[PDB]
Ligand SMILES: CCc1cc2nc(C(F)(F)F)c(C#N)c(N3CC[C@](C)(O)C3)c2[nH]1
Protein backbone atom coordinates (compact mmCIF):
# COMPACT_ATOMS: atom_id res chain seq x y z
CA UNK A 1 0.00 0.00 0.00
CA UNK A 2 2.06 2.93 -1.39
CA UNK A 3 -0.58 5.34 -2.80
CA UNK A 4 -3.05 7.83 -1.27
CA UNK A 5 -6.47 7.89 -2.95
CA UNK A 6 -8.55 11.05 -3.19
CA UNK A 7 -12.19 10.62 -4.19
CA UNK A 8 -14.05 13.79 -5.14
CA UNK A 9 -14.21 16.59 -7.73
CA UNK A 10 -12.03 17.85 -10.57
CA UNK A 11 -13.08 21.32 -11.87
CA UNK A 12 -11.56 23.82 -14.33
CA UNK A 13 -10.97 26.99 -12.32
CA UNK A 14 -10.97 30.03 -14.61
CA UNK A 15 -9.06 32.50 -12.36
CA UNK A 16 -9.19 36.30 -12.62
CA UNK A 17 -6.80 38.19 -10.34
CA UNK A 18 -8.33 41.58 -9.28
CA UNK A 19 -6.59 44.46 -7.34
CA UNK A 20 -9.90 45.10 -5.49
CA UNK A 21 -13.05 42.94 -5.27
CA UNK A 22 -15.72 44.23 -7.74
CA UNK A 23 -18.85 46.15 -6.63
CA UNK A 24 -22.19 44.85 -8.10
CA UNK A 25 -22.90 46.22 -11.66
CA UNK A 26 -19.24 47.52 -11.85
CA UNK A 27 -16.78 47.03 -14.76
CA UNK A 28 -13.43 46.11 -13.12
CA UNK A 29 -10.44 45.00 -15.21
CA UNK A 30 -8.35 42.11 -13.92
CA UNK A 31 -4.53 42.23 -13.48
CA UNK A 32 -3.97 38.63 -14.70
CA UNK A 33 -5.91 35.51 -15.83
CA UNK A 34 -5.03 31.82 -15.44
CA UNK A 35 -6.52 28.37 -15.89
CA UNK A 36 -5.93 25.95 -13.05
CA UNK A 37 -7.02 22.41 -12.14
CA UNK A 38 -9.50 22.73 -9.26
CA UNK A 39 -11.81 20.62 -7.11
CA UNK A 40 -11.01 19.71 -3.46
CA UNK A 41 -9.72 16.13 -4.12
CA UNK A 42 -7.87 17.27 -7.29
CA UNK A 43 -6.16 20.05 -5.23
CA UNK A 44 -5.28 17.71 -2.33
CA UNK A 45 -3.68 15.43 -5.06
CA UNK A 46 -1.49 18.32 -6.39
CA UNK A 47 -0.36 19.11 -2.81
CA UNK A 48 0.26 15.36 -1.98
CA UNK A 49 2.32 14.98 -5.21
CA UNK A 50 4.36 18.12 -4.36
CA UNK A 51 4.97 16.67 -0.86
CA UNK A 52 6.48 13.56 -2.57
CA UNK A 53 3.56 11.21 -1.83
CA UNK A 54 2.41 8.80 -4.63
CA UNK A 55 -1.28 9.62 -5.05
CA UNK A 56 -4.25 8.76 -7.24
CA UNK A 57 -7.31 10.76 -8.19
CA UNK A 58 -10.82 9.24 -8.51
CA UNK A 59 -13.60 11.43 -9.83
CA UNK A 60 -15.96 11.84 -12.77
CA UNK A 61 -14.52 13.31 -15.98
CA UNK A 62 -16.34 14.05 -19.26
CA UNK A 63 -14.07 13.50 -22.37
CA UNK A 64 -13.34 16.74 -24.22
CA UNK A 65 -10.59 19.38 -24.62
CA UNK A 66 -11.22 20.60 -21.02
CA UNK A 67 -10.54 17.05 -19.64
CA UNK A 68 -7.42 16.95 -21.90
CA UNK A 69 -6.02 20.03 -19.96
CA UNK A 70 -7.00 18.57 -16.52
CA UNK A 71 -5.61 15.07 -17.34
CA UNK A 72 -2.38 16.66 -18.71
CA UNK A 73 -2.08 18.65 -15.40
CA UNK A 74 -2.54 15.50 -13.26
CA UNK A 75 0.03 13.64 -15.47
CA UNK A 76 2.53 16.59 -15.26
CA UNK A 77 2.08 16.32 -11.43
CA UNK A 78 2.34 12.50 -11.44
CA UNK A 79 -1.25 12.09 -10.20
CA UNK A 80 -2.62 8.65 -11.12
CA UNK A 81 -5.77 9.10 -13.31
CA UNK A 82 -6.24 5.28 -13.82
CA UNK A 83 -9.19 5.21 -11.36
CA UNK A 84 -11.01 8.12 -13.12
CA UNK A 85 -14.72 7.30 -13.61
CA UNK A 86 -15.08 8.67 -17.21
CA UNK A 87 -18.70 9.60 -18.01
CA UNK A 88 -20.54 9.97 -21.38
CA UNK A 89 -23.56 12.06 -20.21
CA UNK A 90 -22.34 15.58 -19.27
CA UNK A 91 -19.57 18.23 -19.51
CA UNK A 92 -16.49 18.75 -17.21
CA UNK A 93 -17.45 21.26 -14.40
CA UNK A 94 -15.94 24.75 -14.56
CA UNK A 95 -15.82 27.70 -12.16
CA UNK A 96 -15.12 31.45 -12.18
CA UNK A 97 -12.64 32.38 -9.49
CA UNK A 98 -12.10 36.05 -8.53
CA UNK A 99 -8.92 36.27 -6.42
CA UNK A 100 -8.61 39.61 -4.61
CA UNK A 101 -4.85 40.37 -4.75
CA UNK A 102 -4.85 42.78 -1.76
CA UNK A 103 -6.08 40.14 0.73
CA UNK A 104 -5.85 36.82 -1.14
CA UNK A 105 -9.61 36.17 -0.77
CA UNK A 106 -11.13 33.78 -3.29
CA UNK A 107 -14.71 33.91 -4.65
CA UNK A 108 -15.79 30.73 -6.53
CA UNK A 109 -18.84 30.84 -8.89
CA UNK A 110 -19.22 27.14 -9.67
CA UNK A 111 -20.94 25.56 -12.69
CA UNK A 112 -21.90 22.06 -11.54
CA UNK A 113 -22.63 20.37 -14.90
CA UNK A 114 -24.83 17.66 -13.20
CA UNK A 115 -22.28 15.02 -14.37
CA UNK A 116 -23.01 11.61 -12.69
CA UNK A 117 -21.05 11.36 -9.39
CA UNK A 118 -18.64 8.44 -8.64
CA UNK A 119 -20.89 5.59 -7.39
CA UNK A 120 -20.22 2.56 -5.08
CA UNK A 121 -20.29 0.61 -8.41
CA UNK A 122 -17.37 2.73 -9.83
CA UNK A 123 -15.62 2.29 -6.41
CA UNK A 124 -16.17 -1.55 -6.42
CA UNK A 125 -13.80 -1.93 -9.47
CA UNK A 126 -10.93 -0.36 -7.39
CA UNK A 127 -7.97 -2.50 -6.18
CA UNK A 128 -7.68 -1.36 -2.53
CA UNK A 129 -4.34 -3.21 -2.01
CA UNK A 130 -2.19 -0.35 -3.55
CA UNK A 131 -3.58 2.29 -1.06
CA UNK A 132 -1.94 3.40 2.22
CA UNK A 133 -4.71 6.03 2.72
CA UNK A 134 -8.11 6.93 1.15
CA UNK A 135 -9.69 10.46 1.37
CA UNK A 136 -13.31 11.10 0.39
CA UNK A 137 -14.58 14.66 -0.41
CA UNK A 138 -18.21 14.73 0.89
CA UNK A 139 -20.56 15.04 -2.17
CA UNK A 140 -22.95 12.02 -2.75
CA UNK A 141 -23.19 11.07 0.99
CA UNK A 142 -25.60 8.03 0.78
CA UNK A 143 -23.51 6.53 -2.14
CA UNK A 144 -20.10 7.39 -0.49
CA UNK A 145 -21.26 5.65 2.77
CA UNK A 146 -21.43 2.43 0.63
CA UNK A 147 -17.76 3.06 -0.46
CA UNK A 148 -16.90 3.77 3.24
CA UNK A 149 -18.61 0.52 4.47
CA UNK A 150 -16.65 -1.32 1.67
CA UNK A 151 -13.37 0.03 3.22
CA UNK A 152 -14.35 -0.96 6.84
CA UNK A 153 -15.20 -4.50 5.54
CA UNK A 154 -11.78 -4.75 3.72
CA UNK A 155 -9.99 -3.54 6.94
CA UNK A 156 -11.61 -6.27 9.15
CA UNK A 157 -10.34 -8.94 6.66
CA UNK A 158 -6.83 -7.32 7.02
CA UNK A 159 -4.04 -7.31 9.73
CA UNK A 160 -3.62 -4.03 11.80
CA UNK A 161 -0.28 -3.69 9.87
CA UNK A 162 -1.79 -3.41 6.34
CA UNK A 163 -5.06 -1.53 7.19
CA UNK A 164 -6.21 1.45 5.01
CA UNK A 165 -6.48 4.78 6.88
CA UNK A 166 -9.56 6.78 5.93
CA UNK A 167 -10.25 10.53 6.00
CA UNK A 168 -13.57 12.28 5.26
CA UNK A 169 -14.11 15.99 4.41
CA UNK A 170 -17.42 17.75 5.32
CA UNK A 171 -16.97 21.08 3.38
CA UNK A 172 -20.47 22.21 2.34
CA UNK A 173 -23.26 22.84 4.94
CA UNK A 174 -25.48 20.03 3.52
CA UNK A 175 -27.52 17.80 5.92
CA UNK A 176 -27.06 14.65 3.71
CA UNK A 177 -23.25 14.83 4.34
CA UNK A 178 -23.56 14.89 8.22
CA UNK A 179 -23.94 11.04 8.08
CA UNK A 180 -20.22 10.71 6.96
CA UNK A 181 -19.21 12.25 10.37
CA UNK A 182 -19.54 9.08 11.04
CA UNK A 183 -16.88 7.09 9.12
CA UNK A 184 -13.08 7.47 8.69
CA UNK A 185 -10.19 7.69 11.23
CA UNK A 186 -9.81 11.46 10.49
CA UNK A 187 -12.82 13.72 9.90
CA UNK A 188 -12.18 17.21 8.46
CA UNK A 189 -15.03 19.69 9.21
CA UNK A 190 -14.94 23.15 7.58
CA UNK A 191 -15.38 26.49 9.46
CA UNK A 192 -18.46 27.15 7.15
CA UNK A 193 -20.21 23.87 8.29
CA UNK A 194 -19.32 24.78 11.94
CA UNK A 195 -20.84 28.33 11.78
CA UNK A 196 -23.95 26.71 10.09
CA UNK A 197 -24.32 24.70 13.37
CA UNK A 198 -24.07 27.77 15.71
CA UNK A 199 -20.39 27.23 16.66
CA UNK A 200 -18.33 30.48 16.95
CA UNK A 201 -14.91 28.71 17.33
CA UNK A 202 -12.97 25.60 16.24
CA UNK A 203 -12.85 24.31 19.88
CA UNK A 204 -16.67 24.89 20.28
CA UNK A 205 -17.27 22.95 17.02
CA UNK A 206 -14.94 20.08 18.07
CA UNK A 207 -16.45 19.54 21.55
CA UNK A 208 -19.98 19.89 20.06
CA UNK A 209 -19.49 17.61 17.01
CA UNK A 210 -17.16 14.85 18.45
CA UNK A 211 -20.20 12.75 19.49
CA UNK A 212 -20.98 12.27 15.73
CA UNK A 213 -17.61 10.59 14.95
CA UNK A 214 -16.62 6.85 14.89
CA UNK A 215 -14.89 5.27 17.99
CA UNK A 216 -11.19 6.31 17.74
CA UNK A 217 -11.70 8.98 15.03
CA UNK A 218 -9.87 12.38 15.08
CA UNK A 219 -12.12 15.41 14.30
CA UNK A 220 -10.14 18.30 12.64
CA UNK A 221 -11.33 21.93 12.19
CA UNK A 222 -9.30 24.66 10.48
CA UNK A 223 -10.39 28.28 11.28
CA UNK A 224 -8.56 30.50 8.69
CA UNK A 225 -6.27 33.02 10.52
CA UNK A 226 -7.16 31.36 13.86
CA UNK A 227 -5.12 28.28 12.86
CA UNK A 228 -6.62 24.80 13.32
CA UNK A 229 -7.76 22.53 16.12
CA UNK A 230 -8.06 18.74 16.55
CA UNK A 231 -9.87 16.37 19.00
CA UNK A 232 -9.06 12.71 19.40
CA UNK A 233 -10.23 9.83 21.63
CA UNK A 234 -8.26 11.15 24.70
CA UNK A 235 -10.48 14.25 24.81
CA UNK A 236 -7.42 16.51 24.66
CA UNK A 237 -7.84 19.49 22.42
CA UNK A 238 -4.93 20.12 20.13
CA UNK A 239 -4.34 23.52 18.54
CA UNK A 240 -1.97 24.91 15.94
CA UNK A 241 -1.48 28.66 15.42
CA UNK A 242 -1.60 29.59 11.68
CA UNK A 243 1.49 30.29 9.60
CA UNK A 244 0.28 33.46 7.77
CA UNK A 245 2.51 34.84 5.03
CA UNK A 246 3.34 38.61 5.41
CA UNK A 247 1.42 39.15 2.12
CA UNK A 248 -1.66 36.85 1.63
CA UNK A 249 -2.07 36.83 -2.23
CA UNK A 250 -4.12 33.58 -3.02
CA UNK A 251 -6.31 31.46 -0.61
CA UNK A 252 -7.78 29.30 -3.46
CA UNK A 253 -7.06 25.67 -2.55
CA UNK A 254 -5.63 26.60 0.90
CA UNK A 255 -8.09 24.39 2.81
CA UNK A 256 -7.15 21.57 0.39
CA UNK A 257 -3.41 22.24 1.06
CA UNK A 258 -4.33 22.03 4.77
CA UNK A 259 -6.15 18.65 4.37
CA UNK A 260 -3.47 17.00 2.16
CA UNK A 261 -0.67 18.16 4.52
CA UNK A 262 -2.53 16.68 7.58
CA UNK A 263 -3.21 13.41 5.63
CA UNK A 264 0.46 13.39 4.47
CA UNK A 265 1.90 13.99 7.99
CA UNK A 266 -0.41 11.39 9.57
CA UNK A 267 0.40 8.91 6.68
CA UNK A 268 4.12 9.45 7.54
CA UNK A 269 3.16 8.42 11.13
CA UNK A 270 3.57 11.76 12.90
CA UNK A 271 1.51 12.98 15.92
CA UNK A 272 -1.84 14.72 15.38
CA UNK A 273 -0.24 17.83 16.94
CA UNK A 274 2.67 17.62 14.40
CA UNK A 275 0.19 17.01 11.54
CA UNK A 276 -2.02 19.95 12.70
CA UNK A 277 1.10 22.21 12.76
CA UNK A 278 2.31 20.98 9.32
CA UNK A 279 -1.17 21.43 7.85
CA UNK A 280 -1.13 25.08 8.94
CA UNK A 281 2.45 25.45 7.75
CA UNK A 282 1.88 24.30 4.20
CA UNK A 283 -1.57 26.04 3.92
CA UNK A 284 0.06 29.31 5.10
CA UNK A 285 3.01 29.03 2.67
CA UNK A 286 0.48 28.51 -0.17
CA UNK A 287 -1.54 31.67 0.83
CA UNK A 288 1.52 33.78 -0.11
CA UNK A 289 1.92 32.16 -3.55
CA UNK A 290 -0.20 32.01 -6.71
CA UNK A 291 -1.18 28.40 -7.42
CA UNK A 292 0.51 25.42 -5.73
CA UNK A 293 4.09 25.63 -7.12
CA UNK A 294 6.61 26.70 -4.47
CA UNK A 295 5.06 25.27 -1.26
CA UNK A 296 8.08 22.83 -1.05
CA UNK B 297 -6.24 26.83 -48.72
CA UNK B 298 -6.70 28.89 -51.94
CA UNK B 299 -8.82 32.01 -51.22
CA UNK B 300 -9.99 33.54 -54.61
CA UNK B 301 -8.87 37.14 -55.31
CA UNK B 302 -10.96 40.05 -53.90
CA UNK B 303 -13.53 37.74 -52.31
CA UNK B 304 -13.30 38.19 -48.51
CA UNK B 305 -14.42 40.82 -45.99
CA UNK B 306 -11.67 41.21 -43.34
CA UNK B 307 -12.46 42.27 -39.77
CA UNK B 308 -9.59 43.57 -37.61
CA UNK B 309 -10.15 43.83 -33.84
CA UNK B 310 -10.85 41.98 -30.56
CA UNK B 311 -11.66 38.34 -29.88
CA UNK B 312 -12.33 37.57 -26.19
CA UNK B 313 -13.67 34.49 -24.31
CA UNK B 314 -16.66 35.57 -22.28
CA UNK B 315 -17.52 33.23 -19.42
CA UNK B 316 -21.10 34.21 -18.42
CA UNK B 317 -22.73 33.02 -15.17
CA UNK B 318 -26.36 33.60 -14.11
CA UNK B 319 -26.65 33.76 -10.29
CA UNK B 320 -29.56 33.74 -7.73
CA UNK B 321 -27.81 36.50 -5.70
CA UNK B 322 -24.51 38.41 -6.32
CA UNK B 323 -21.67 36.48 -4.56
CA UNK B 324 -20.01 38.08 -1.53
CA UNK B 325 -16.19 37.99 -1.12
CA UNK B 326 -14.60 34.64 0.01
CA UNK B 327 -17.69 32.56 -0.99
CA UNK B 328 -18.08 29.26 -2.94
CA UNK B 329 -21.51 29.53 -4.68
CA UNK B 330 -23.34 27.56 -7.46
CA UNK B 331 -24.50 29.38 -10.64
CA UNK B 332 -27.88 28.70 -12.28
CA UNK B 333 -26.31 28.57 -15.82
CA UNK B 334 -22.88 29.08 -17.40
CA UNK B 335 -22.14 30.05 -20.99
CA UNK B 336 -18.71 30.25 -22.68
CA UNK B 337 -19.16 32.69 -25.56
CA UNK B 338 -16.85 34.07 -28.22
CA UNK B 339 -17.10 37.89 -28.01
CA UNK B 340 -15.37 41.00 -29.42
CA UNK B 341 -16.60 43.50 -32.06
CA UNK B 342 -14.58 42.31 -35.08
CA UNK B 343 -15.12 38.69 -33.86
CA UNK B 344 -18.97 39.16 -33.69
CA UNK B 345 -19.06 40.94 -37.13
CA UNK B 346 -17.21 37.97 -38.66
CA UNK B 347 -19.85 35.52 -37.28
CA UNK B 348 -22.70 37.69 -38.83
CA UNK B 349 -20.92 38.05 -42.19
CA UNK B 350 -20.48 34.26 -42.31
CA UNK B 351 -24.23 33.76 -41.58
CA UNK B 352 -25.09 36.38 -44.27
CA UNK B 353 -23.22 34.20 -46.80
CA UNK B 354 -19.97 36.18 -47.07
CA UNK B 355 -16.42 34.68 -47.18
CA UNK B 356 -14.87 36.40 -44.17
CA UNK B 357 -11.61 36.46 -42.25
CA UNK B 358 -10.66 37.69 -38.77
CA UNK B 359 -7.45 39.47 -37.77
CA UNK B 360 -6.82 39.83 -34.09
CA UNK B 361 -4.25 38.98 -31.45
CA UNK B 362 -4.26 35.54 -29.83
CA UNK B 363 -1.70 33.66 -27.69
CA UNK B 364 -1.26 29.86 -28.16
CA UNK B 365 -3.27 28.09 -25.52
CA UNK B 366 -6.51 26.51 -24.48
CA UNK B 367 -8.49 29.86 -24.56
CA UNK B 368 -7.28 30.43 -28.22
CA UNK B 369 -8.22 26.78 -28.98
CA UNK B 370 -11.84 27.34 -27.85
CA UNK B 371 -12.08 30.64 -29.87
CA UNK B 372 -10.48 29.15 -33.03
CA UNK B 373 -12.91 26.19 -32.93
CA UNK B 374 -15.88 28.68 -32.44
CA UNK B 375 -14.64 30.84 -35.34
CA UNK B 376 -14.46 27.68 -37.54
CA UNK B 377 -17.90 26.55 -36.27
CA UNK B 378 -19.13 29.92 -37.72
CA UNK B 379 -17.14 29.40 -40.96
CA UNK B 380 -14.76 32.26 -40.17
CA UNK B 381 -11.27 32.08 -41.84
CA UNK B 382 -8.68 32.43 -39.01
CA UNK B 383 -5.40 32.41 -41.07
CA UNK B 384 -4.61 36.14 -40.38
CA UNK B 385 -4.51 35.85 -36.61
CA UNK B 386 -1.48 37.61 -35.13
CA UNK B 387 -0.22 34.78 -32.87
CA UNK B 388 1.70 36.28 -29.83
CA UNK B 389 4.74 35.14 -27.77
CA UNK B 390 3.74 37.14 -24.64
CA UNK B 391 0.34 37.75 -22.98
CA UNK B 392 -3.03 36.13 -22.19
CA UNK B 393 -5.73 35.55 -24.91
CA UNK B 394 -8.53 37.91 -23.66
CA UNK B 395 -11.03 36.37 -21.28
CA UNK B 396 -13.82 38.24 -19.46
CA UNK B 397 -15.99 37.01 -16.56
CA UNK B 398 -19.61 38.19 -16.47
CA UNK B 399 -21.87 37.67 -13.45
CA UNK B 400 -25.61 38.26 -14.15
CA UNK B 401 -27.99 38.60 -11.16
CA UNK B 402 -31.36 36.81 -11.64
CA UNK B 403 -33.33 39.01 -9.13
CA UNK B 404 -32.38 42.42 -10.75
CA UNK B 405 -30.71 41.63 -14.15
CA UNK B 406 -27.56 43.71 -13.33
CA UNK B 407 -24.29 42.59 -15.03
CA UNK B 408 -20.94 42.75 -13.16
CA UNK B 409 -17.93 42.39 -15.53
CA UNK B 410 -14.29 41.41 -14.75
CA UNK B 411 -12.65 42.67 -17.98
CA UNK B 412 -9.76 40.91 -19.69
CA UNK B 413 -6.14 41.90 -18.86
CA UNK B 414 -3.95 44.37 -20.84
CA UNK B 415 -1.14 41.68 -21.17
CA UNK B 416 -1.82 40.78 -24.87
CA UNK B 417 -0.57 43.34 -27.46
CA UNK B 418 -2.93 44.55 -30.23
CA UNK B 419 -2.38 43.85 -33.98
CA UNK B 420 0.42 46.15 -35.20
CA UNK B 421 1.09 47.99 -38.45
CA UNK B 422 4.13 45.62 -38.84
CA UNK B 423 1.81 42.63 -38.17
CA UNK B 424 -0.63 44.11 -40.83
CA UNK B 425 2.27 44.83 -43.31
CA UNK B 426 2.74 41.01 -43.73
CA UNK B 427 -0.86 40.48 -45.06
CA UNK B 428 -1.39 40.05 -48.84
CA UNK B 429 -4.39 42.30 -49.37
CA UNK B 430 -5.39 40.97 -52.85
CA UNK B 431 -7.88 38.37 -51.38
CA UNK B 432 -9.97 41.13 -49.67
CA UNK B 433 -12.80 43.18 -51.26
CA UNK B 434 -13.46 45.13 -48.02
CA UNK B 435 -11.47 45.71 -44.79
CA UNK B 436 -13.24 46.69 -41.53
CA UNK B 437 -11.20 47.99 -38.61
CA UNK B 438 -12.49 48.08 -35.02
CA UNK B 439 -10.93 51.22 -33.43
CA UNK B 440 -8.47 50.16 -30.69
CA UNK B 441 -4.71 51.05 -31.08
CA UNK B 442 -5.45 54.13 -33.23
CA UNK B 443 -1.79 55.20 -33.98
CA UNK B 444 -1.04 51.70 -35.43
CA UNK B 445 -4.40 51.20 -37.29
CA UNK B 446 -3.87 54.58 -39.01
CA UNK B 447 -0.71 53.09 -40.64
CA UNK B 448 -2.75 49.96 -41.65
CA UNK B 449 -5.33 52.35 -43.21
CA UNK B 450 -2.53 54.38 -44.89
CA UNK B 451 -1.24 50.99 -46.24
CA UNK B 452 -4.73 50.08 -47.74
CA UNK B 453 -4.83 53.62 -49.25
CA UNK B 454 -1.35 53.05 -50.83
CA UNK B 455 -2.47 49.62 -52.20
CA UNK B 456 -5.69 51.22 -53.64
CA UNK B 457 -3.85 54.13 -55.38
CA UNK B 458 -2.08 51.48 -57.64
CA UNK B 459 -5.29 49.43 -58.58
CA UNK B 460 -8.22 49.87 -61.10
CA UNK B 461 -11.55 51.08 -59.50
CA UNK B 462 -13.07 47.55 -59.96
CA UNK B 463 -10.29 46.01 -57.72
CA UNK B 464 -10.09 48.76 -55.06
CA UNK B 465 -10.62 47.55 -51.43
CA UNK B 466 -13.59 49.36 -49.73
CA UNK B 467 -12.85 50.26 -46.07
CA UNK B 468 -14.88 50.82 -42.89
CA UNK B 469 -13.95 51.95 -39.41
CA UNK B 470 -15.81 51.51 -36.09
CA UNK B 471 -15.27 54.18 -33.32
CA UNK B 472 -17.28 52.51 -30.49
CA UNK B 473 -15.29 53.40 -27.34
CA UNK B 474 -15.38 57.05 -26.09
CA UNK B 475 -11.53 57.23 -26.10
CA UNK B 476 -9.86 60.40 -27.46
CA UNK B 477 -7.11 58.45 -29.40
CA UNK B 478 -9.80 56.93 -31.63
CA UNK B 479 -11.38 60.19 -32.94
CA UNK B 480 -8.53 60.49 -35.48
CA UNK B 481 -9.95 57.35 -37.16
CA UNK B 482 -12.93 59.45 -38.40
CA UNK B 483 -10.62 60.74 -41.20
CA UNK B 484 -10.12 57.17 -42.54
CA UNK B 485 -12.30 54.74 -44.46
CA UNK B 486 -15.17 54.93 -46.98
CA UNK B 487 -17.69 54.04 -44.15
CA UNK B 488 -17.33 55.34 -40.58
CA UNK B 489 -19.41 53.85 -37.78
CA UNK B 490 -19.88 55.99 -34.70
CA UNK B 491 -21.58 54.55 -31.60
CA UNK B 492 -24.46 56.16 -29.60
CA UNK B 493 -22.12 56.14 -26.52
CA UNK B 494 -19.27 57.97 -28.45
CA UNK B 495 -21.85 60.48 -29.85
CA UNK B 496 -23.30 61.10 -26.32
CA UNK B 497 -19.78 61.55 -24.76
CA UNK B 498 -19.10 64.19 -27.54
CA UNK B 499 -22.29 66.05 -26.48
CA UNK B 500 -24.73 64.75 -29.14
CA UNK B 501 -28.23 63.65 -28.09
CA UNK B 502 -29.47 62.02 -31.40
CA UNK B 503 -28.09 60.26 -34.53
CA UNK B 504 -28.96 63.51 -36.48
CA UNK B 505 -26.95 65.76 -34.07
CA UNK B 506 -24.01 63.28 -34.23
CA UNK B 507 -23.90 62.91 -38.04
CA UNK B 508 -24.32 66.69 -38.76
CA UNK B 509 -21.89 67.49 -35.91
CA UNK B 510 -19.11 65.02 -36.91
CA UNK B 511 -19.43 64.77 -40.74
CA UNK B 512 -16.67 67.42 -40.97
CA UNK B 513 -14.19 64.92 -39.35
CA UNK B 514 -14.49 62.34 -42.17
CA UNK B 515 -12.48 62.12 -45.44
CA UNK B 516 -13.86 63.35 -48.83
CA UNK B 517 -16.69 61.05 -50.02
CA UNK B 518 -17.11 59.00 -46.80
CA UNK B 519 -20.43 57.84 -45.24
CA UNK B 520 -20.84 58.47 -41.46
CA UNK B 521 -23.28 55.93 -39.88
CA UNK B 522 -24.95 56.11 -36.41
CA UNK B 523 -27.40 53.57 -34.98
CA UNK B 524 -29.36 54.87 -31.94
CA UNK B 525 -30.90 51.66 -30.51
CA UNK B 526 -34.78 51.89 -30.61
CA UNK B 527 -34.52 55.22 -32.63
CA UNK B 528 -33.18 53.36 -35.70
CA UNK B 529 -30.10 54.43 -37.61
CA UNK B 530 -28.98 57.33 -39.77
CA UNK B 531 -26.36 57.67 -42.49
CA UNK B 532 -24.84 60.86 -43.94
CA UNK B 533 -23.16 60.92 -47.34
CA UNK B 534 -21.04 63.49 -49.20
CA UNK B 535 -24.38 64.81 -50.75
CA UNK B 536 -25.56 66.15 -47.35
CA UNK B 537 -28.80 64.07 -47.51
CA UNK B 538 -29.43 62.72 -43.92
CA UNK B 539 -30.70 59.16 -44.46
CA UNK B 540 -32.78 57.31 -41.89
CA UNK B 541 -34.23 53.85 -41.14
CA UNK B 542 -36.51 53.08 -38.23
CA UNK B 543 -35.66 50.17 -35.94
CA UNK B 544 -37.34 46.79 -36.63
CA UNK B 545 -37.89 45.64 -32.97
CA UNK B 546 -38.52 41.93 -32.21
CA UNK B 547 -41.81 40.76 -30.45
CA UNK B 548 -39.85 40.22 -27.17
CA UNK B 549 -36.20 41.34 -26.63
CA UNK B 550 -34.00 38.29 -25.66
CA UNK B 551 -30.33 39.32 -26.24
CA UNK B 552 -29.09 42.77 -27.38
CA UNK B 553 -25.44 41.72 -26.86
CA UNK B 554 -23.71 41.84 -30.25
CA UNK B 555 -26.57 43.70 -32.00
CA UNK B 556 -24.35 46.74 -32.81
CA UNK B 557 -21.93 44.30 -34.45
CA UNK B 558 -24.84 42.64 -36.34
CA UNK B 559 -25.84 46.12 -37.59
CA UNK B 560 -22.25 47.01 -38.64
CA UNK B 561 -21.65 43.69 -40.46
CA UNK B 562 -25.09 43.97 -42.21
CA UNK B 563 -24.43 47.57 -43.42
CA UNK B 564 -20.93 46.37 -44.64
CA UNK B 565 -22.49 43.28 -46.34
CA UNK B 566 -25.28 45.23 -48.07
CA UNK B 567 -22.82 47.93 -49.27
CA UNK B 568 -20.35 45.11 -50.38
CA UNK B 569 -23.25 43.62 -52.45
CA UNK B 570 -23.65 46.90 -54.43
CA UNK B 571 -26.74 48.12 -52.53
CA UNK B 572 -27.34 51.78 -51.64
CA UNK B 573 -26.65 53.50 -48.31
CA UNK B 574 -30.48 53.65 -47.77
CA UNK B 575 -30.97 49.91 -48.63
CA UNK B 576 -27.96 49.09 -46.29
CA UNK B 577 -29.24 51.19 -43.33
CA UNK B 578 -32.60 49.39 -43.69
CA UNK B 579 -31.05 45.89 -43.92
CA UNK B 580 -28.76 46.70 -40.94
CA UNK B 581 -31.80 47.67 -38.83
CA UNK B 582 -33.76 44.60 -40.04
CA UNK B 583 -30.93 42.05 -39.17
CA UNK B 584 -29.96 43.79 -35.86
CA UNK B 585 -33.70 43.88 -34.99
CA UNK B 586 -34.17 40.13 -35.70
CA UNK B 587 -30.99 39.33 -33.64
CA UNK B 588 -32.44 41.11 -30.54
CA UNK B 589 -35.26 38.50 -30.23
CA UNK B 590 -32.75 35.60 -30.51
CA UNK B 591 -30.24 34.17 -28.01
CA UNK B 592 -26.84 34.44 -29.77
CA UNK B 593 -26.55 34.63 -33.61
CA UNK B 594 -28.08 31.20 -34.69
CA UNK B 595 -31.05 32.26 -36.92
CA UNK B 596 -30.40 35.96 -37.79
CA UNK B 597 -30.86 35.22 -41.57
C1 LIG C 1 -10.99 34.26 5.17
C2 LIG C 1 -10.21 33.51 4.12
C3 LIG C 1 -8.89 33.11 4.65
C4 LIG C 1 -7.79 33.91 4.93
C5 LIG C 1 -6.74 33.04 5.37
N1 LIG C 1 -5.47 33.32 5.74
C6 LIG C 1 -4.69 32.29 6.05
C7 LIG C 1 -3.29 32.69 6.62
F1 LIG C 1 -3.20 32.45 7.92
F2 LIG C 1 -2.30 32.04 6.05
F3 LIG C 1 -3.04 33.98 6.44
C8 LIG C 1 -5.09 30.89 6.00
C9 LIG C 1 -4.09 29.86 6.14
N2 LIG C 1 -3.28 29.07 6.21
C10 LIG C 1 -6.44 30.58 5.68
N3 LIG C 1 -7.14 29.36 5.70
C11 LIG C 1 -7.53 28.75 4.43
C12 LIG C 1 -8.43 27.62 4.89
C13 LIG C 1 -7.71 27.10 6.16
C14 LIG C 1 -6.95 25.80 5.92
O1 LIG C 1 -8.64 26.94 7.25
C15 LIG C 1 -6.75 28.22 6.60
C16 LIG C 1 -7.27 31.70 5.33
N4 LIG C 1 -8.58 31.77 4.90
Ligand SMILES: CCc1cc2nc(C(F)(F)F)c(C#N)c(N3CC[C@](C)(O)C3)c2[nH]1
Nearest residue numbers: 523524525526543545555556559584585588
Ligand atom coordinates in the same frame (compact mmCIF):
# COMPACT_ATOMS: atom_id res chain seq x y z
C1 LIG D 1 -30.80 50.18 -24.83
C2 LIG D 1 -30.40 48.78 -25.24
C3 LIG D 1 -31.06 48.40 -26.52
C4 LIG D 1 -32.35 47.93 -26.71
C5 LIG D 1 -32.50 47.70 -28.12
N1 LIG D 1 -33.59 47.28 -28.80
C6 LIG D 1 -33.49 47.21 -30.12
C7 LIG D 1 -34.84 46.90 -30.87
F1 LIG D 1 -35.25 47.93 -31.61
F2 LIG D 1 -34.74 45.86 -31.69
F3 LIG D 1 -35.83 46.62 -30.03
C8 LIG D 1 -32.28 47.49 -30.88
C9 LIG D 1 -32.29 47.28 -32.30
N2 LIG D 1 -32.34 47.10 -33.43
C10 LIG D 1 -31.10 47.95 -30.19
N3 LIG D 1 -29.82 48.37 -30.72
C11 LIG D 1 -28.59 47.68 -30.32
C12 LIG D 1 -27.49 48.39 -31.10
C13 LIG D 1 -28.17 49.05 -32.33
C14 LIG D 1 -27.60 48.56 -33.66
O1 LIG D 1 -28.12 50.49 -32.31
C15 LIG D 1 -29.65 48.67 -32.19
C16 LIG D 1 -31.25 48.05 -28.76
N4 LIG D 1 -30.39 48.49 -27.75
Ligand SMILES: [Cl-]
Nearest residue numbers: 310312411412
Ligand atom coordinates in the same frame (compact mmCIF):
# COMPACT_ATOMS: atom_id res chain seq x y z
CL1 LIG E 1 -11.98 45.88 -24.65
